[PDB]
Design a protein around this ligand. Sequence first.
Ligand SMILES: NCc1ccc(C(=O)N[C@H]2Cc3cccc(C(=O)O)c3O[B-]2(O)O)cc1
Ligand SMILES: [Zn+2]
Ligand SMILES: [Zn+2]
Length: 219
Amino acid sequence: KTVIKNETGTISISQLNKNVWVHTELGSFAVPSNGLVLNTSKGLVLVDSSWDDKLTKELIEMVEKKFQKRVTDVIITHAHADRIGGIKTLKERGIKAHSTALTAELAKKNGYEEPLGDLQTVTNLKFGNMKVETFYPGKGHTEDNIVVWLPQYNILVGGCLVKSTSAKDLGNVADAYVNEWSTSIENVLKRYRNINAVVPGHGEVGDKGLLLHTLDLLK
Ligand SMILES: NCc1ccc(C(=O)N[C@H]2Cc3cccc(C(=O)O)c3O[B-]2(O)O)cc1
Ligand SMILES: [Zn+2]
Ligand SMILES: [Zn+2]
């Protein structure tokens, strides 16, 4: 798979297909974090920003240069820093920051600028030719965590709800609901029965197996 790094190695993008890339940044907490870059005919769309504004700026600038179009939209998958840390950069550049109402409320509570709160339990978006579904499966990693589905590729962005193979514990559970997290995972497995790739919030891209791994970690 084609991989491209910033001048520092702190930012990397890896191609999943012609129009879909994973973006990965190193923040301190040293912790890598994943999101998605969608190359569409109407502009770039990101799933999740990054740890802070410095990295988010760098990310945007890298993909805008490479793909020769603007970042127009970002989907924020919950209100923690690795997801929403760059929200100030998005707002001041006129980049639309989509989220559930709950994610927006929690962002505000925690002193972040507010994303749009436009996403429902199920929301279907289209950016040029690129179809994007957002789904709130229930509480897990956080009370507000959502997943993102690309039905044209059967690619699932699990976010921090979904642990990577390298993860040997549930990680940061300060704001988690460990009794509901299994049901929420099961809700994802029920909705998306045929998955080609699953992108975890941290770690290597996997498949449906990452969902099953997460269930085992919850026992
Ligand atoms: N409510 C206090 C609080 C604020 C922010 C964070 C936070 O930014 N957590 C992120 C960074 C991180 C650091 C280490 C592991 C994970 C993980 O996904 O498990 C991980 O993902 B989080 O979204 O929880 C946690 C608690
Ligand atoms: Zn989190
Ligand atoms: Zn996380």
